[PDB]
Scaffold this motif. Structure first.
Motif, PDB file in Angstrom:
ATOM      1  N   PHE A  98       0.854  -1.183   0.000  1.00 60.32           N
ATOM      2  CA  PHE A  98       0.000   0.000   0.000  1.00 60.32           C
ATOM      3  C   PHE A  98       0.888   1.230   0.000  1.00 60.32           C
ATOM      4  CE2 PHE A  98      -1.097   3.330   3.035  1.00 60.32           C
ATOM      5  CZ  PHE A  98      -2.326   3.792   2.617  1.00 60.32           C
ATOM      6  N   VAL A 107      -3.928   6.704  -3.464  1.00 59.39           N
ATOM      7  CA  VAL A 107      -3.318   5.497  -2.942  1.00 59.39           C
ATOM      8  C   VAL A 107      -3.112   4.545  -4.099  1.00 59.39           C
ATOM      9  CG1 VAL A 107      -4.644   5.899  -0.826  1.00 59.39           C
ATOM     10  CG2 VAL A 107      -5.232   3.963  -2.314  1.00 59.39           C
ATOM     11  N   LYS A 109      -2.428   0.670  -4.778  1.00 59.81           N
ATOM     12  CA  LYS A 109      -2.526  -0.647  -4.167  1.00 59.81           C
ATOM     13  C   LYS A 109      -2.011  -1.677  -5.165  1.00 59.81           C
ATOM     14  CE  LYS A 109      -5.987  -3.940  -2.462  1.00 59.81           C
ATOM     15  NZ  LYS A 109      -7.305  -4.446  -2.968  1.00 59.81           N
ATOM     16  N   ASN A 162      -7.730   8.618  -2.419  1.00 60.62           N
ATOM     17  CA  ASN A 162      -7.635   8.335  -0.995  1.00 60.62           C
ATOM     18  C   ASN A 162      -8.970   8.574  -0.302  1.00 60.62           C
ATOM     19  OD1 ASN A 162      -6.877   8.173   1.779  1.00 60.62           O
ATOM     20  ND2 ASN A 162      -4.908   9.167   1.371  1.00 60.62           N
ATOM     21  N   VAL A 163      -9.335   7.620   0.561  1.00 63.92           N
ATOM     22  CA  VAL A 163     -10.506   7.782   1.411  1.00 63.92           C
ATOM     23  C   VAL A 163     -10.245   8.837   2.475  1.00 63.92           C
ATOM     24  CG1 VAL A 163     -12.010   6.613   3.074  1.00 63.92           C
ATOM     25  CG2 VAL A 163     -11.349   5.438   0.944  1.00 63.92           C
ATOM     26  N   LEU A 164      -9.095   8.746   3.155  1.00 64.71           N
ATOM     27  CA  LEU A 164      -8.700   9.632   4.247  1.00 64.71           C
ATOM     28  C   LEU A 164      -8.212  10.977   3.713  1.00 64.71           C
ATOM     29  CD1 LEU A 164      -6.929   7.074   6.661  1.00 64.71           C
ATOM     30  CD2 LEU A 164      -9.317   7.566   6.170  1.00 64.71           C
ATOM     31  N   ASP A 175     -11.962  -0.618   9.874  1.00 62.38           N
ATOM     32  CA  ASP A 175     -12.274  -1.377   8.662  1.00 62.38           C
ATOM     33  C   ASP A 175     -13.538  -2.191   8.942  1.00 62.38           C
ATOM     34  OD1 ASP A 175     -12.367  -3.674   6.822  1.00 62.38           O
ATOM     35  OD2 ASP A 175     -10.358  -3.062   6.198  1.00 62.38           O
ATOM     36  N   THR A 193      -5.613  -0.510  12.852  1.00 60.24           N
ATOM     37  CA  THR A 193      -6.716  -0.751  11.919  1.00 60.24           C
ATOM     38  C   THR A 193      -7.774  -1.596  12.634  1.00 60.24           C
ATOM     39  OG1 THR A 193      -4.997  -0.808  10.154  1.00 60.24           O
ATOM     40  CG2 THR A 193      -7.272  -1.402   9.527  1.00 60.24           C
ATOM     41  N   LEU A 234     -14.477   1.800   5.028  1.00 62.07           N
ATOM     42  CA  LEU A 234     -13.374   2.405   5.757  1.00 62.07           C
ATOM     43  C   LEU A 234     -13.856   3.691   6.411  1.00 62.07           C
ATOM     44  CD1 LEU A 234     -10.304   2.050   6.344  1.00 62.07           C
ATOM     45  CD2 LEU A 234      -9.900   3.653   4.440  1.00 62.07           C
ATOM     46  N   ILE A 276     -14.455   0.136   0.137  1.00 64.03           N
ATOM     47  CA  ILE A 276     -13.170  -0.330  -0.372  1.00 64.03           C
ATOM     48  C   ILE A 276     -13.198  -1.832  -0.639  1.00 64.03           C
ATOM     49  CG2 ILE A 276     -12.027   1.481   0.954  1.00 64.03           C
ATOM     50  CD1 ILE A 276     -11.059  -0.397   2.892  1.00 64.03           C
ATOM     51  N   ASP A 277     -12.250  -2.283  -1.481  1.00 58.32           N
ATOM     52  CA  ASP A 277     -11.988  -3.695  -1.791  1.00 58.32           C
ATOM     53  C   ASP A 277     -13.141  -4.351  -2.544  1.00 58.32           C
ATOM     54  OD1 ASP A 277     -10.889  -6.239  -1.943  1.00 58.32           O
ATOM     55  OD2 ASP A 277     -10.910  -6.643   0.215  1.00 58.32           O
TER      56      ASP A 277
HETATM   57  O1  LIG Z   1      -4.914   5.611   4.247  1.00 53.91           O
HETATM   58  C1  LIG Z   1      -5.604   4.827   3.600  1.00 53.91           C
HETATM   59  N1  LIG Z   1      -6.405   5.279   2.546  1.00 53.91           N
HETATM   60  C2  LIG Z   1      -7.174   4.373   1.821  1.00 53.91           C
HETATM   61  O2  LIG Z   1      -7.875   4.789   0.897  1.00 53.91           O
HETATM   62  C3  LIG Z   1      -7.144   3.074   2.146  1.00 53.91           C
HETATM   63  N2  LIG Z   1      -7.784   2.037   1.612  1.00 53.91           N
HETATM   64  C4  LIG Z   1      -7.425   0.945   2.277  1.00 53.91           C
HETATM   65  N3  LIG Z   1      -6.563   1.281   3.232  1.00 53.91           N
HETATM   66  C5  LIG Z   1      -5.993   0.223   4.127  1.00 53.91           C
HETATM   67  O3  LIG Z   1      -5.560  -0.939   3.353  1.00 53.91           O
HETATM   68  C6  LIG Z   1      -6.324  -2.103   3.823  1.00 53.91           C
HETATM   69  C7  LIG Z   1      -7.640  -2.287   3.054  1.00 53.91           C
HETATM   70  O4  LIG Z   1      -7.365  -3.152   1.938  1.00 53.91           O
HETATM   71  P1  LIG Z   1      -8.523  -4.000   1.175  1.00 53.91           P
HETATM   72  O5  LIG Z   1      -8.421  -3.997  -0.309  1.00 53.91           O
HETATM   73  O6  LIG Z   1      -9.888  -3.303   1.651  1.00 53.91           O
HETATM   74  O7  LIG Z   1      -8.573  -5.519   1.794  1.00 53.91           O
HETATM   75  P2  LIG Z   1      -7.301  -6.539   1.771  1.00 53.91           P
HETATM   76  O8  LIG Z   1      -6.624  -6.688   3.089  1.00 53.91           O
HETATM   77  O9  LIG Z   1      -7.830  -7.952   1.180  1.00 53.91           O
HETATM   78  O10 LIG Z   1      -6.285  -6.015   0.631  1.00 53.91           O
HETATM   79  C8  LIG Z   1      -6.567  -1.769   5.283  1.00 53.91           C
HETATM   80  O11 LIG Z   1      -5.326  -1.824   6.018  1.00 53.91           O
HETATM   81  C9  LIG Z   1      -7.031  -0.346   5.069  1.00 53.91           C
HETATM   82  O12 LIG Z   1      -6.983   0.389   6.291  1.00 53.91           O
HETATM   83  C10 LIG Z   1      -6.387   2.602   3.154  1.00 53.91           C
HETATM   84  N4  LIG Z   1      -5.592   3.469   3.905  1.00 53.91           N
END
Ligand SMILES: O=c1[nH]c(=O)c2ncn([C@@H]3O[C@H](COP(=O)(O)OP(=O)(O)O)[C@@H](O)[C@H]3O)c2[nH]1
Ligand SMILES: O=c1[nH]c(=O)c2ncn([C@@H]3O[C@H](COP(=O)(O)OP(=O)(O)OP(=O)(O)O)[C@@H](O)[C@H]3O)c2[nH]1
Ligand SMILES: O=c1[nH]c(=O)c2ncn([C@@H]3O[C@H](COP(=O)(O)OP(=O)(O)O)[C@@H](O)[C@H]3O)c2[nH]1
Lengths: 297, 317
Positions: A98, A107, A109, A162-164, A175, A193, A234, A276-277
């Motif tokens: 990430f 972001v 990914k 970015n969400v945040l 989450d 998290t 999120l 998300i996801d």
């Molecule tokens: O600062 C951020 N801005 C974002 O926009 C954002 N989107 C996700 N995240 C983090 O990444 C994982 C989710 O990933 P995910 O695709 O929902 O699920 P997986 O763990 O299968 O990859 C968790 O740690 C989330 O807290 C973010 N952090």
């Protein structure tokens, strides 16, 4: 003079590639409408330098961009200028699989081949949906999708907004999704998290209005109607009081998911919320929307 | 916004390629010195698009540029901005293998694999010669060397500054080698619109060029230096290109164009091979004179130098 100087070589390639493709696109006219072939199209460039420009870039690398026209259009519909996207990726190496751009605006990914195929399957319906929302939606906003090849290994990336907030420090992250809870390993991190069980075992609520739920119901109805599951919501909390520019002060055209707390909140807070996801059923839709319907007041 | 529209895909790829390499070069800082690696270096890109951006470019092509740092340096040393080079190649397709950019400023010759080899074999001495003469030379001024691949076929091209003016019409043209043998222009050539006359046509016409002592001496000193350099490198079959522009005829044609509805003054910073005719001279003329075709290695080279210089000396008074 963009030296693509990065914490490691694959970031240099990401920077070089987004710079390259976004310039190339600036020499491609904006169409009157997207065409179906745009939904099956890709750009591919293979770089093979010898004794040249190896200071920060690798000498041999490959960069592929999936549906450049579709993602340029999405970028547009989300209100993101192409030169701003390019500046956020190339002006300074992205940061910490990430990443965010140096300015925390987007972001990046790392995803799987299955995820790239899945997005290819959902893309035309997703794009049409974003047209019909006028971009007013809580779904992930996809800005680009790339395959990089460095030293023979392929790496796949999806860039999202970015969400945040990219400027306000976020103080607690959840989450929200049987039952899931935070590993004590994750619970000991600099910014934890917290998952679904510890938003109820902590007693946080988010006091606001109802139109958030009106948008969410449309979104998750769409996700289910497309057979998508495993998506999360999120949630970020920023405690203004913890603390030129100011506190609780944000630009809503940049932090699109941000929301001011009601005067009735105990603490002075600002929240950020998005889905998300979404790259992978109908029951999930109702259970998940119920959980999130009971958290606003 | 650059479409790279061109009548042939290879031209489009040439425009794309020069655009790409100049913009890439603008993110590479400008070195203090050249390193020897810089003389063995190359850049290669291989494009394979799919259902994307196929209006003008092919979906699949390759572009290779040789010693991009050395030719950037040479461009600098010859007074040419990279931005201007890019714009002359990309603002509109080059025209009529031999092309010039739409603005007539640079010449693009299709060359052979061996010509590319010989250019590498001479490039380090050529760069240092340009350096120690400050760009004051009749030799070709090389600005770029590329390999294009369109439809699985490789085309080598060498970009040079034009011997001829980019504004002034050129009314007669000769290709002189100084050879003992009878170099004469075919009835075919002599029947073209602007034919390229050879040695014996230059002599059987009684052409001389009155340039005036100061320019004549600068010219003969330039040429003696240049062709000793070519002999040093064992190079042969090079020619002197001379173009004559008739000022009076230029004015007449200019007015025949403006009637359908300075004069003879040129800028030596761009028309670098250009010389005005002597004050006390028969017709007001402007000449362009430079050495061309210097990529063919080994009559000896020193003998070729001798015969060449002896001929070119007496072509101007
Ligand atoms: O600062 C951020 N801005 C974002 O926009 C954002 N989107 C996700 N995240 C983090 O990444 C994982 C989710 O990933 P995910 O695709 O929902 O699920 P997986 O763990 O299968 O990859 C968790 O740690 C989330 O807290 C973010 N952090
Ligand atoms: O003295 C030299 N120093 C060099 O640094 C150099 N670089 C290229 N060349 C000559 O260029 C011609 C073919 O063109 P090129 O070499 O670009 O094709 P290639 O064999 O590399 O690729 P490929 O056709 O197999 O895909 C051949 O005469 C090469 O020997 C050089 N000669
Ligand atoms: O810098 C230049 N500006 C020019 O405008 C120009 N025109 C011709 N040339 C050279 O002269 C020979 C071709 O002469 P040509 O007889 O017309 O054609 P060819 O001899 O191939 O049949 C080759 O060396 C050409 O590269 C020029 N060089």
């Amino acid at each position: 003079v963009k030296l693509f100087r990065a914490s490691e070589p694959i970031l240099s390639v990401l920077m070089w590639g987004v710079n390259h493709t976004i310039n190339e696109l600036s020499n491609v006219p904006v169409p009157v409408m997207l065409m179906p072939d745009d939904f099956k199209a890709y750009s591919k460039i293979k770089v093979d330098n010898h004794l040249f420009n190896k200071e920060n870039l690798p000498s041999r690398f490959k960069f592929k961009e999936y549906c450049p026209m579709v993602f340029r259009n999405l970028r547009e519909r989300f209100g993101i200028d192409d030169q701003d996207y390019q500046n956020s990726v190339t002006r300074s190496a992205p940061i910490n699989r990430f990443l965010t751009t140096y300015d925390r605006r987007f972001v990046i990914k790392t995803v799987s081949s299955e995820d790239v195929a899945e997005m290819h399957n959902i893309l035309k319906k997703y794009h049409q949906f974003i047209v019909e929302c006028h971009g007013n939606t809580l779904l992930p906003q996809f800005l680009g999708m790339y395959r990089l090849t460095v030293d023979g290994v392929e790496t796949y990336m999806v860039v999202t907004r970015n969400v945040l907030s990219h400027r306000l420090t976020v103080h607690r992250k959840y989450d929200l999704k049987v039952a899931r809870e935070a590993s004590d390993k994750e619970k000991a991190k600099d910014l934890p998290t917290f998952k679904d069980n510890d938003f109820l075992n902590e007693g946080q609520k988010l006091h606001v209005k109802k139109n958030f739920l009106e948008k969410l119901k449309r979104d998750v109805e769409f996700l289910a109607q497309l057979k998508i599951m495993d998506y999360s919501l999120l949630v970020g909390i920023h405690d203004v009081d913890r603390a030129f520019f100011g506190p609780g002060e944000f630009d809503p055209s940049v932090d699109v998911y941000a929301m001011k707390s009601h005067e009735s909140s105990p603490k002075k807070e600002v929240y950020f919320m998005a889905i998300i996801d979404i790259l992978t059923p109908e029951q999930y839709s109702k259970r998940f929307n119920e959980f999130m319907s009971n958290i606003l007041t």
